[PDB]
Design a protein around this nucleic acid. Structure first.
Ligand SMILES: Nc1nc2c(ncn2[C@H]2CC[C@@H](COP(=O)(O)OP(=O)(O)OP(=O)(O)O)O2)c(=O)[nH]1
Ligand SMILES: [Mg+2]
Ligand SMILES: [Mg+2]
Ligand SMILES: [Zn+2]
Lengths: 270, 1362, 49, 49, 79
DNA sequence: CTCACGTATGCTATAATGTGCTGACGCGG
DNA sequence: TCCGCGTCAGACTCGTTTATAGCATACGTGAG
């Protein structure tokens, strides 16, 4: 009843040939020249090495199969750039490649918000330092204590440890139902804006047609593009000083609405 | 948008592409630094839309001016952010991927389609083994699995001209190549030639699948996914918590799994990787997609961060918690609040105290509105700040808004509709809601911290529906049974009891008053007790033949108190109503009487008045609870020492040899159960009266005014059962198993328990409390199954004009009539011109309403049997007629068309169960059962009537019964049935058939413990097959040596004896077999499990003797725990484990073949020449003998009847009446009144579907299951036009299946089994036109019932044109 | 009172305007349900009048 | 449940035959569990873990 | 009425239709500003419609007849 | 118009090449 | 042996463990 993808794959790998030194050299020379069978046999025979490496960095982030596959990608690059002319063995060279590709993938895919390798490498140094501090300081590393030891900026160390903060699932207990939509306004707030927008239209046809024209076209109320000082001036043909004159007159008209219906504006003082 | 229906069908790869707005290539979510969406990632703005309203990502276009302006630089459309909740994406899969739902979901569609077992397909999918897709060379045919080595062999030899592949590509190719048409014809050809019984079903099911597949226009290839859709971002959001951290949906982790492995597969294909590694990646890709769709179905679910399995797509739809039950069939609501409830005795029935601050908040928009119309507020934000400041003018405005505005009060749990009621609110200072006492019954509200939800009906329509339909005043009667739910209790009962009840002389015995006012003045003046006997002059107002009220003045001999209560009593009612000492039982009748004579508003006022006076006099009285109020009988210790030496003597006789554990258990329980009753009756004589009061001269006896006795007798609170435990004996307590402890508690609570009695008490107590927590769930689950089944049922028509009905007899079980025929046919439309006995004139019409007046006439004539119109026999298609139903029991008049009857039925069946679960359990400790069903003693003189009985005369002179179903009845003179009495098997009758007995005579005695095996014939006894150790067991005694035989059943029995039936066989002196009088049957009595025979083989028996005692341990306690499963078994239409056999066709029968002992009963009817032959077990013994002319459904075997067999042979009214009576048996045992018409609704919903034989003008053919209404519609047009006539047969569906068989898949999905429902609907291409209630509630539309029935019927006629 | 987004704001405005009229819409929970079933690869369409 | 041995029995449950199937369970404080059980046909079986 | 709506149910009959008709009438007074036939007596539009139905002034048929009348008067004015 | 800054893909040669939690609910179809 | 069910609201609190090398050229956009 072998159903498991992992056990099936490991059964298939076991069924492979194990390579010797002379065999590795023969196949490797044919492989670099571009043999089909040679490349396939070298990869298939050295899958076992990937697994002994993929099962070594277990319980770190990525799953065995996931690391077994990314590790296999390193195997392929290893076979492509292997030097059979050098007397030194293949297993030694491949180990570098398999560990490199696995580590690179574990630094990228693991983190939901994709964290760049530059920051990840810096983070490594901060954490190793924290470990040595913890062994001697019975307490745990502070941000400032780590920063002192590396001779680096406190702010930089804090930014990095912040990026270490891992993600809280909303569906894991639900948190979704507590946390409200912040971008959506309550009908209370949306209705308040309707009242303001409606009042403005009526407020535009209450004062002068010369000032309302300026504010309507500039703010983009009845207009479309919020024309700045120069564009509003150029339209009505008015001057820069005239802009300040219409503005001051427009505020005086609003003061009249305020002393009449200011009962709402004076409440803006809390 | 406004739409007609919804359809579901398989998604084509290209269909999936249509919804998509781009392919998400990368797992990248957002940028760690600028927290904005990455390139072509999972939150890509280029695909799903802009993060901010009308703004591109790189920020070049802003403001509402830019509309649909796709920014050239970043590639982001300037529209609203809302779009990111609606736009979908997609994923290009390298390898085809099977959709788990069509693979794993049973039965499965891919397997059933290919006729290929799941195992085979899986070996193919996980790349263990190859499958042949097609070989022109028959060498290898189709769908034949080859292992890795099997593929190498044929590949050299044949190769090329045979195509075999591995993985989902193989299965997709196999699906693409398969021709639905041709296989349909091939399978039809197979069924024509050789239709084997069981494989005809499976072949017909694949035929239905193939037909349905082609009609749906679904393609089998699409079961395998090439394109994978991506859910819009906002429906799987990544949001920042306050802490700076982020929180995301698990769907993001599952999508990232799928994309990583898919892209890695693309890579390994570009790199030409060796095939072992390609395979691993294809397995991992299918694993990731299957986890994303439905995680946990494909084996071990993928655990995320905690260890908890990631929540997948299907998990958000499926569970109760999915989206159906949580967000759609119920929601969180605006203008809602809650608080603790507290009494408002000052309130009138239509009012409730609503806290100031609570109401301020709930009616915020209504305040804003009035504030602006008065011009007190310039605008909304100023109005808000005036409310924030809580200004004095705002209170006055709020008072003005709340006036005549109804508010909904709700209490959990909402079991029945009265769990929501509307009230007019009364603004109160303080934080607690004030509830009217009289409605506390409907809510089951007690003020020890319960809370209530408040809801504000906003619209004019909602206000009107609250005031008219949902108002407290208007919902007085229970919709479950006709009775008033609005009933005084506790203080109110006690006060009116105190006022009405009379005392000897007291102050001012035998005075005379002018009316109740002089009486009130006398009492309050302090010259008269409320219990003084006196003759007052009250003037009652009796209604005449018309609407005018007649006035009558006469002198009455009552008491001061009753006279003053007359002042509350409305005109129309008799003074005799108040002239008795009033209890809660009498006050309920008072309010019902007042409702039916005077009407609603008067009863409303009268109810409030009763409550006010009841509290008021309760408080005046000053009734309370001292320890001396709990009176112990002087003669307890005697009764107990007697009982105790007696039980001691039976325990000593136990070591001797006359006793099993079951026998002595029964005997000790009987002794203590009788002792408990004795001590209780001693306490109640000593307490109830034992009032020595000297009347005006000498001594008298009258009823005691002891406080606790008054509380019990009035029905104010505790019952006689509770007061037994207080003042008498606590009694036998029952273990959590239900089995009763052998040592009872002798002491009571006044006496105090000792450590051992208290510890023993705990068992029963805690089992009770655990029962409320755990059993409530099954009660509630039954409510929900009932609701789902009877959601659609609505009053559609006024009169279908049907004559058909179900003959309802008076339930006369256990001497005293349990439920009268009058009450069972009250409020029900009659039929078949039911007149009086003497057939020469009609008494009642064929279409009328049975009012209390018609019912009272029925009683003078003593009508026993009445055909009434019922819901089950109603002809209305897609609902039921107002006449077939009858009165809306909650309204007290004929039901309104449009009322949702089914819901009311389900709620009203469900409520009592759910309420009686918590209720009897926390409230009781011990079990006060009474098992002493030995002797029938008859209460009234008459003649013995024995229907269904076959008994043999024993050597005693006595009639020893040997029938299973035996009904002793008590006939009077005229010849009516008045008392019934279920005689058992093994009974000794005092007198035989049709003999006179006097009042209080014993007519039959039987042992309750032990059902004896009683032999008909006389002779010697032979042991057949009774090998010791094999089938029986041997147990020996001392000095001489009495052995006793116990029949070990197949449970304890060895493999050797399995096939042997052990039986006591009757032979004569010669040692030949004695025959059973007049048949060819030799006497032989088959002994069941543990049949304890005393008398060893070769003993001369006489006839009518006890051979064998099978022990009958009744460990059952009288609660709903045992009862509700019976109810649920009935509603779910379960065949019992031993069904009793019925004759299928009328006609004359002889025996044919026998398999050793197994009977092959051969029926050969008279007219119908075809025989009907049945295989029957050997040990199952027949009631019928040989050649009798038996009709359809005559009982052949001993055993319970299957509702299926009843329906199938006798018919609708038979099976409906079987269910109604068998369910009602349980509820009646717990004192629960539910009207039959509710049960009848649900049975109608059970009998929804029907199987069809032959064809009509439509597509019926053999054995399609279609709904009864739709086949009747066809039959109506067929009979007028002609065409092929179609025989039909109604099928019973039990609740769960009946709800899933509904031709709405939105209702089926919302109920249960959502994954399976949606696969079957998707494959059928099913279209839901939304006729039902659940369907409309889900889409948030007007219900097709109540208010909505008007609007909904207007839409249905808008379908005819425009 | 629950999902209907446009409906709740519109009816709030009506209640301050004193119209006491509903103007109902489509509950957003159902829109989600549709999207969740299409994410399963089941085509679930609204068929028009 | 204390580590040690426990002898239990399905009182019916399995097989409407109604056979009492006896079992031993050896429970350690740490390790795999060792089960012995009877079958309806009176064959002694071991379930490791 | 004020307390209980039984009398108004007795006029029309179907509780459901009572609610529709009282709704329609309350909407006229709410929006159209239609004058109430009974003295308002500080009563909400919900209760006034029920008073009018109780006394038998308002009814589905009557409301439809007056709708046609006002609608035909408006047709007359437009033409 | 040019460099700096942020991000990514690259290569390293002793040999090493086969895995690895929690169990127990109960009734029905 | 598998998979389907197992009342309905309400209150509060907590919480988001781990490992990885270091350095040079290449790929690509943004700022002055
Ligand atoms: N569904 C449900 N309802 C409950 C539960 N506990 C209480 N209730 C409801 C129904 C009964 C009601 C009051 O509970 P109580 O225990 O006070 O019982 P009661 O019926 O008032 O009896 P008593 O006279 O002993 O107070 O509240 C529960 O666990 N589930
Ligand atoms: Mg209580
Ligand atoms: Mg309570
Ligand atoms: Zn842009």
């Amino acid at each position: 009843r072998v159903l498991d993808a992992t056990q099936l794959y490991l059964g298939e790998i076991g069924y492979s040939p194990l390579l010797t030194a002379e065999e590795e050299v023969y196949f490797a020379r044919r492989a670099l020249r571009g043999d089909v069978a040679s490349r396939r046999r070298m990869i298939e025979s050295n899958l076992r090495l990937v697994v002994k490496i993929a099962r070594r960095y277990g319980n770190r982030g990525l799953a065995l199969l996931d690391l077994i596959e990314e590790g296999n990608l390193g195997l392929i690059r290893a076979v492509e750039k292997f030097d059979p002319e050098r007397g030194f063995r293949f297993s030694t060279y491949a180990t570098w490649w398999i560990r490199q590709t696995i580590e690179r993938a574990i630094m990228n895919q693991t983190r939901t918000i994709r964290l760049p390798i530059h920051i990840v490498k810096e983070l490594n140094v901060y954490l190793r330092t924290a470990r040595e501090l913890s062994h001697k300081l019975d307490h745990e590393p502070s941000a400032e204590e780590i920063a002192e030891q590396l001779d680096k900026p406190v702010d930089d160390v804090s930014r990095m440890l912040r990026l270490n903060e891992r993600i809280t699932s909303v569906d894991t207990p639900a948190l979704l139902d507590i946390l409200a939509d912040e971008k959506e306004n309550g009908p209370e707030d949306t209705t308040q804006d309707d009242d303001m927008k409606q009042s403005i239209v009526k407020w535009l046809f209450e004062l002068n047609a010369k000032q309302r024209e300026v504010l309507a076209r500039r703010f983009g109320l009845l207009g479309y593009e919020a024309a700045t000082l120069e564009d509003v001036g150029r339209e009505i043909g008015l001057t820069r000083e005239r802009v300040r004159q219409i503005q001051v007159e427009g505020l005086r008209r609003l003061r009249e609405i305020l002393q009449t219906q200011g009962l709402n504006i004076e409440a803006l003082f809390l | 948008e406004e739409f007609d229906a919804i359809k579901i069908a398989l998604a084509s790869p290209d269909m999936i592409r249509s919804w998509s707005f781009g392919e998400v290539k990368k797992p990248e979510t957002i940028n760690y630094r600028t927290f904005k969406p990455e390139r072509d990632g999972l939150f890509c703005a280029r695909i799903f839309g802009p993060v901010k309203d009308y703004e591109c990502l790189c920020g070049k276009y802003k403001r509402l001016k830019h509309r649909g302006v796709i920014c050239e630089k970043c590639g982001v459309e300037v529209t609203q952010t809302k779009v990111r909740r609606e736009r979908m994406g997609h994923i290009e899969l390298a390898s085809p991927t099977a959709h788990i739902w069509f693979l794993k979901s049973l039965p499965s569609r891919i397997g059933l389609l290919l006729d290929m077992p799941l195992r085979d397909i899986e070996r193919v999918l996980y790349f263990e083994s190859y499958v042949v897709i097609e070989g022109g060379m028959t060498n290898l045919e189709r769908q034949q699995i080859l292992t890795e080595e099997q593929y190498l062999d044929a590949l050299e030899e044949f190769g090329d001209e045979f195509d075999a592949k591995m993985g989902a590509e193989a299965i997709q190719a196999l699906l693409k190549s398969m021709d639905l048409e041709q296989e349909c014809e091939q399978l039809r050809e197979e069924l024509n030639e050789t239709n084997s019984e069981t494989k005809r079903k499976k072949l017909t099911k694949r035929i239905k699948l193939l037909e349905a597949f082609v009609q749906s226009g679904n393609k089998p290839e699409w079961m395998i996914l090439t394109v994978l859709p991506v859910l819009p971002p906002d429906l799987r959001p990544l949001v920042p918590l306050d802490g700076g951290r982020f929180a995301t949906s698990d769907l993001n982790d599952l999508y990232r799994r799928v994309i990583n492995r898919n892209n890695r597969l693309k890579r390994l294909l570009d790199l030409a990787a060796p095939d072992i590694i390609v395979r691993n990646e294809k397995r991992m890709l299918q694993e990731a997609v299957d986890a994303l769709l439905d995680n946990g179905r494909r084996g071990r679910a993928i655990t995320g961060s905690n260890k908890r399995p990631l929540k997948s797509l299907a998990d958000m739809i499926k569970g109760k918690q999915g989206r159906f039950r949580q967000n759609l069939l119920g929601k969180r609501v605006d203008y809602s609040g809650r608080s603790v409830i507290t009494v408002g005795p000052y309130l009138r029935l239509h009012q409730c105290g609503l806290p100031k601050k609570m109401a301020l908040e709930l009616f915020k928009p209504f305040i804003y509105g009035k504030l602006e119309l008065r011009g007190l507020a310039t605008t909304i934000k100023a109005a808000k700040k005036m409310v924030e400041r809580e200004e004095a003018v705002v209170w006055d405005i709020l008072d003005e808004v709340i006036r005549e505005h109804p508010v909904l009060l709700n209490r959990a749990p909402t079991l029945h509709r009265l769990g929501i009621q509307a009230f007019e609110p009364v603004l109160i200072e303080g934080k607690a809601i004030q509830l009217h006492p009289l409605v506390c019954a409907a809510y089951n509200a007690d003020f020890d911290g319960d809370q209530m939800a408040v809801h504000v009906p906003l619209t004019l329509e909602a206000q009107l529906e609250a005031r008219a339909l949902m108002m407290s005043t208007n919902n007085i009667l229970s919709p479950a049974n006709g009775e008033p739910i609005i009933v005084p209790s506790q203080d109110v009962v006690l006060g009116l009891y105190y006022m009405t009840r009379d005392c000897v002389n007291a102050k001012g015995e035998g005075m005379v008053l002018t009316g109740p006012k002089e009486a009130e003045r006398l009492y309050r003046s302090g010259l008269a007790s409320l219990h003084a006997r006196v003759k007052v002059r009250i003037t009652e107002y009796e209604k005449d033949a018309n609407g005018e009220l007649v006035a009558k003045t006469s002198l009455k001999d009552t008491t001061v108190g009753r006279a003053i209560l007359w002042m509350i009593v409305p005109k129309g009612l008799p003074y005799s109503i108040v002239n008795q000492a009033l209890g809660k039982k009498a006050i309920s009748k008072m309010l019902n009487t007042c409702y039916r004579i005077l009407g609603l508003k008067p009863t409303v006022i009268f109810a409030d008045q009763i409550m006010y006076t009841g509290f008021a006099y309760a408080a005046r009285s000053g009734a309370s609870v001292g320890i001396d109020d709990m009176v112990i009988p002087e003669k307890k210790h005697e009764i107990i020492s007697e009982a105790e030496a007696e039980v001691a003597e039976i325990q000593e006789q136990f070591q001797s040899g006359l006793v099993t554990a079951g026998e002595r258990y029964n005997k000790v329980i009987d002794i203590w159960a009788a002792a408990n009753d004795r001590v209780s009756k001693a306490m109640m004589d000593n307490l109830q009266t034992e009032t020595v009061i000297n009347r005006d001269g000498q001594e008298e006896k009258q009823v005691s005014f002891n406080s606790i006795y008054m509380m019990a007798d009035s029905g104010a609170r505790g019952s006689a059962a509770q007061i037994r435990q207080l003042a008498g004996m606590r009694g036998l307590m029952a273990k959590p198993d239900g089995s009763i402890i052998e040592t009872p508690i002798t002491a009571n609570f006044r006496e105090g328990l000792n450590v051992l009695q208290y510890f023993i008490s705990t068992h029963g107590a805690r089992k009770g409390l655990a029962d409320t927590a755990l059993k409530t769930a099954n009660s509630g689950y039954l409510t929900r199954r009932l609701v789902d089944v009877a959601q659609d049922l609505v009053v559609t028509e006024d009169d279908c004009g049907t004559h058909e009905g179900i003959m309802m007899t008076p339930v006369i079980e256990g001497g005293d009539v349990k439920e009268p025929l009058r009450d069972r046919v009250l409020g029900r439309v009659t039929a078949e011109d039911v007149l009086k006995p003497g057939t020469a004139d009609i008494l009642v019409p064929r279409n009328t309403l049975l009012h209390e007046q018609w019912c009272d006439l029925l009683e003078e004539n003593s009508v026993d049997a009445v055909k009434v119109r019922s819901v089950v026999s109603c002809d209305t298609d897609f609902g039921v007629c107002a006449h077939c139903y009858g009165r809306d029991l909650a309204r007290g008049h004929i039901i309104n068309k449009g009322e949702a009857i089914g819901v009311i039925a389900a709620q009203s069946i469900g409520e009592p169960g759910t309420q009686l679960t918590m209720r009897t359990f926390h409230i009781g400790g011990a079990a006060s059962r009474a098992a002493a069903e030995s002797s029938i003693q008859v209460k009234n003189k008459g003649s013995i009537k024995l229907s269904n009985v076959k008994s043999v005369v024993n050597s005693s002179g006595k009639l020893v019964i040997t029938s299973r179903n035996t009904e002793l009845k008590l006939i009077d003179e005229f010849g009516r049935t008045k008392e019934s009495y279920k005689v058992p098997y093994g009974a000794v009758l005092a007198k035989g058939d049709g003999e006179q007995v006097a009042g209080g005579e014993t007519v039959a005695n039987w042992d309750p413990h032990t059902m004896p095996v009683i032999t008909e014939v006389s002779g010697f006894v032979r042991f057949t097959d009774m090998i010791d150790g094999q089938t029986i067991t041997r147990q020996t005694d001392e000095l001489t040596g009495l052995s006793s035989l116990v029949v070990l059943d197949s449970a304890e029995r060895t493999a050797g004896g399995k096939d042997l039936r052990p039986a006591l066989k009757i032979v004569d002196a010669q040692g030949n077999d004695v025959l059973i009088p007049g048949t060819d049957m030799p006497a032989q009595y088959f002994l069941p499990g543990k049949a304890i025979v005393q008398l060893e083989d070769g003993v001369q028996i006489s006839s009518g003797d006890t051979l064998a005692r099978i022990p009958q341990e009744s460990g059952g306690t009288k609660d709903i725990t045992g009862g509700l499963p019976r109810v649920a078994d009935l509603f779910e239409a379960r065949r019992p484990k031993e069904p009793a056999i019925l004759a299928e066709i009328s006609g004359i029968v002889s025996f044919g073949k026998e398999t050793k002992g197994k009977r092959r009963l051969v029926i050969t009817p008279v007219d119908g020449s075809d025989p009907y032959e049945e295989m029957i077990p050997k040990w199952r013994q027949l009631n019928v003998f040989e050649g009798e002319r038996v009709e359809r459904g005559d009982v052949i075997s001993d055993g319970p009847e299957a509702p299926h067999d009843i329906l199938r042979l006798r018919g609708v009214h038979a099976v409906t009446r079987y269910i109604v009576n068998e369910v009602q048996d349980v509820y009646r045992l717990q004192g629960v009144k539910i009207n039959d018409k509710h049960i009848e609704v649900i049975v109608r919903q059970m009998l929804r579907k029907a199987t069809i034989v032959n064809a009509g003008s439509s597509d019926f053919l053999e054995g399609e299951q279609v709904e009864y209404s739709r086949v009747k519609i066809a039959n109506r047009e067929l009979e007028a036009n002609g065409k092929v006539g179609a025989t039909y047969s109604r099928d019973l569906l039990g609740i769960t299946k009946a709800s899933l068989a509904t031709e709405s898949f939105i209702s089926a999905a919302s109920f249960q089994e959502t994954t399976r429902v949606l696969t079957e609907a998707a494959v059928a291409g099913k279209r839901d036109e939304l006729r039902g209630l659940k369907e409309n509630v889900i889409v948030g539309r007007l219900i097709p019932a109540g208010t909505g029935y008007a609007y909904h019927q207007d839409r249905m006629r808008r379908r005819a044109a425009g | 009172k629950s999902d209907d987004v446009n409906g709740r704001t519109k009816m709030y405005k009506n209640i301050v305007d004193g119209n006491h009229q509903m103007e109902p819409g489509m509950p957003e929970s159902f829109n989600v349900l549709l999207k969740e079933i299409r994410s399963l690869g089941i085509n679930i369409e609204l068929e028009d009048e | 449940r204390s580590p040690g041995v426990f002898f239990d029995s399905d009182k019916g449950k399995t097989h409407s035959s109604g056979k009492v199937l006896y079992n031993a369970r050896i429970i350690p404080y740490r390790g795999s569990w060792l089960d012995f059980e009877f079958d309806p046909k009176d064959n002694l079986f071991v379930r490791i873990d | 009425a004020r307390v209980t709506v039984q009398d108004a149910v007795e006029k029309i009959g179907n509780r459901f239709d009572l609610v529709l008709v009282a709704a329609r009438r309350a909407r006229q007074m709410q929006v159209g500003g239609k004058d109430p036939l009974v003295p308002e007596e500080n009563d909400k539009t919900t209760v006034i419609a029920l008073r009018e139905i109780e006394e038998g002034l308002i009814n589905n048929q009557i409301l439809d007849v007056r709708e046609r009348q006002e609608q035909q008067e408006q047709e007359a004015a437009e033409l």
